[PDB]
Amino acid sequence: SSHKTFRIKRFLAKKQKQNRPIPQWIRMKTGNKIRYNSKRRHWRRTKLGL
Amino acid sequence: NEVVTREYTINIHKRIHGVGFKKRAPRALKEIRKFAMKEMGTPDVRIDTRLNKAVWAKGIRNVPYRIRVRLSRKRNEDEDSPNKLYTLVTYVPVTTFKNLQTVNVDE
Amino acid sequence: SMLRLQKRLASSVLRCGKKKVWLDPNETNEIANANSRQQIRKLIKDGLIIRKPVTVHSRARCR
Amino acid sequence: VRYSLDPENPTKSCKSRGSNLRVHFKNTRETAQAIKGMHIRKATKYLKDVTLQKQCVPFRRYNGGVGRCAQAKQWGWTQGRWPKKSAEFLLHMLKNAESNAELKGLDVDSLVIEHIQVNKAPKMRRRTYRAHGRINPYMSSPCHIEMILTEKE
RNA sequence: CUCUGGCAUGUUGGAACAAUGUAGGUAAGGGAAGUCGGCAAGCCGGAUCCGUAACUUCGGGAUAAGGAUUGGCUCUAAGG
RNA sequence: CCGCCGCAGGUGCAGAUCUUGGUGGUAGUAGCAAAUAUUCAAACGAGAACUUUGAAGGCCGAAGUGGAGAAGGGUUCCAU
Ligand SMILES: [K+]
Ligand SMILES: [K+]
Ligand SMILES: [Mg+2]
Ligand SMILES: [Mg+2]
Ligand SMILES: [Mg+2]
Ligand SMILES: [Mg+2]
Ligand SMILES: [Mg+2]
Ligand SMILES: [Mg+2]
Ligand SMILES: [Mg+2]
Ligand SMILES: [Mg+2]
Ligand SMILES: [Mg+2]
Ligand SMILES: [Mg+2]
Ligand SMILES: [Mg+2]
Ligand SMILES: [Mg+2]
Ligand SMILES: [Mg+2]
Ligand SMILES: [Mg+2]
Ligand SMILES: [Mg+2]
Ligand SMILES: [Mg+2]
Ligand SMILES: [Mg+2]
Ligand SMILES: [Mg+2]
Ligand SMILES: [Mg+2]
Ligand SMILES: [Mg+2]
Ligand SMILES: [Mg+2]
Ligand SMILES: [Mg+2]
Ligand SMILES: [Mg+2]
Ligand SMILES: [Mg+2]
Ligand SMILES: [Mg+2]
């Protein structure tokens, strides 16, 4: 909702910042097994639950 | 005589006989388009917006029974297309359809 | 091209509905490279974009 | 790259393959069997007529529920269809095989499709929603296609 | 039904118009003989003016029942 | 990695509506049929029934398919 507490807004801030793909140069690093961000959240598929 | 222009009366009523109400005007456009291909012997028939407006003038189900059109075969040399000749069908408003017969139009 | 932005912007500037905005079907290239309201205003002054008249609903039959 | 069959004369042969093609395997298999042993010009004309519904692909093995058509009497069968997407995928691959023959310097208007094979490819997962809160598979059946064309006198 | 405003027919399109369906409608003569059963459908329907029974806790029953009229146009009279 | 002499065991599968994983016939089948409706031309594009623009025919019909909010969502907003 447009009405939100500071704690909930700050919580939603962290969730947006985390929902980004991996940098492409992560893959080039030695002993790398992370080929794609497996913790990607889509707003319409999976809900935060808050 | 690749480029030729003729005037024709199409009896849309016989062509759209039995068609449902919501399909009578769209079928009239399809019957005109396939009337042009049979006569001018070419695919890629272009129907002038005014002929579309004329077929749709009385709504979707009360299509006019007869329509006077001008089939003008022209050269599609402006584009590198597989068809060299295309037909442009144009609307010819008339007061009556009696004694009107297929006629050639001179440039 | 795609002129949703210009159609939306023109309706806001002309203060009308999108159904009353007329973008010139011939000079679409000049309309297309207009991504600000300043340029939409100029195209309105230049006559490229016009506001269509209200559909006629006559009360003459009622009168 | 191992085609199922090695060509008899490799210097007189061209090959083309494709993997994970989003076209129906059952439709493509029936289409490939129709153009097997055809001249490349005959096959190109035939496939375009399929896209125009002037010549049909007879469905001989995967024919369950396939309707009858008059154009199937030309294959000695009763059931036929006109799978457009399969024909375009095969037409796209034939042209590529043709370009490979040119790159090898082969007489194009002598090539015959001697070998053509359609293999089921890994399926892709999609879901459909059914009555009473049930979710069912909605799966695509792609295919791997390979062909080898050889010159014939 | 239309204007302002909105939309593109509700996750597809083309061709045809078989049976059986789902939704709608009509049907000579008869008129519930159908069926467990008038189920379903049908009949009625607004308004104006008439006319309204048994019974009754006198409040109702009651839009009981039953009947007539109804458009368009041109006027007349009345109501500030 | 195995033979032979001994030692030890979580030691032999066809079944248990067995467990987990995979795969078929069904089958290119059922289906993609609730809420009237689309058509013409052009543009962009490798590609247009579906995008955009213009024109036409329609619908919502102010108890809206309109314009704004609360809760809930949490960036879905806007541009490329
Ligand atoms: K009865
Ligand atoms: K809200
Ligand atoms: Mg949800
Ligand atoms: Mg069938
Ligand atoms: Mg058939
Ligand atoms: Mg479902
Ligand atoms: Mg559910
Ligand atoms: Mg519909
Ligand atoms: Mg649609
Ligand atoms: Mg929907
Ligand atoms: Mg009747
Ligand atoms: Mg009767
Ligand atoms: Mg009777
Ligand atoms: Mg009777
Ligand atoms: Mg009886
Ligand atoms: Mg009986
Ligand atoms: Mg009843
Ligand atoms: Mg009574
Ligand atoms: Mg052990
Ligand atoms: Mg055991
Ligand atoms: Mg077992
Ligand atoms: Mg046993
Ligand atoms: Mg089917
Ligand atoms: Mg269906
Ligand atoms: Mg309605
Ligand atoms: Mg309406
Ligand atoms: Mg109402």
Q: Which nucleotide is nearest to C9 (CA to C1')?
A: F78
CA–CA distances in Å: residue D40 to residues B51, C40, D110, D121: 45, 56, 8, 26
- Say if strands B66-75 and D13-21 run parallel, antiparallel, or are unpaired: unpaired
How far is residue D86's CA from residue A14's CA, in Å, rounded to a whole number? 48
Which tokens belong to A36?
């794609």
* Residue C36 contacts strand F, CB under 7 A: no
With both helix axes pointing from N to C terminus, report the angle between C4-13 and C37-45 in degrees, rounded to the nearest 10: 70
CA–CA distances in Å: residue A29 to residues A18, A19, A32, A35: 21, 22, 6, 11
Task: Name the DSSP class of D136.
Answer: E
Q: Which nucleotides of F are covered by protein (CB under 7 A)?
A: 23-24, 26-30, 36-44, 51-58, 69-76, 78-80
How far is residue D88's CA from residue D21's CA, in Å, rounded to a whole number? 12
CA nearest to nucleotide F69 C1': residue: A2
Q: Which residues, listed in sequence order, are joined to residue D18 by a DSSP beta bridge?
A: D145
D146 by Cβ neighbours in 10 Å (0-12 / 13-18 / 19+) ranks as buried
User: What was the experiment behind these coordinates?
Assistant: cryo-EM
| Residues, Cβ < 5 Å to ion ligand 7 | D 133
The experimental resolution of this structure, in angstroms, equals 2.6
The answer to whether the CB of C40 falls within 8 A of the CB of C49 is yes
The string of DSSP letters for B14-81 reads HHTTT--GGGHHHHHHHHHHHHHHHHH--S-EEE-HHHHHHHTTTTTTS--SEEEEEEEEEE-TTS--
With both helix axes pointing from N to C terminus, report the angle between D25-35 and D40-51 in degrees, rounded to the nearest 10: 140
Distance B4 CA to ligand 22 centre (A): 88
Q: Which residues, listed in sequence order, are joined to residue D79 by a DSSP beta bridge?
A: D68
How far is residue B32's CA from residue B19's CA, in Å, rounded to a whole number? 15
Residues 2-61 of chain C in contact with strand E via CB under 7 angstroms: 11, 16-20, 54-55, 57
| Residues, Cβ < 5 Å to ion ligand 5 | D 67, 69
The answer to whether the CB of B48 falls within 8 A of the CB of B68 is no
CA nearest to nucleotide F76 C1': residue: A43
CA nearest to nucleotide F67 C1': residue: C17
How far is residue D47's CA from residue D35's CA, in Å, rounded to a whole number? 8
Single out the residue of C3, C42, C9 nearest to residue C25, CA to CA.
C3
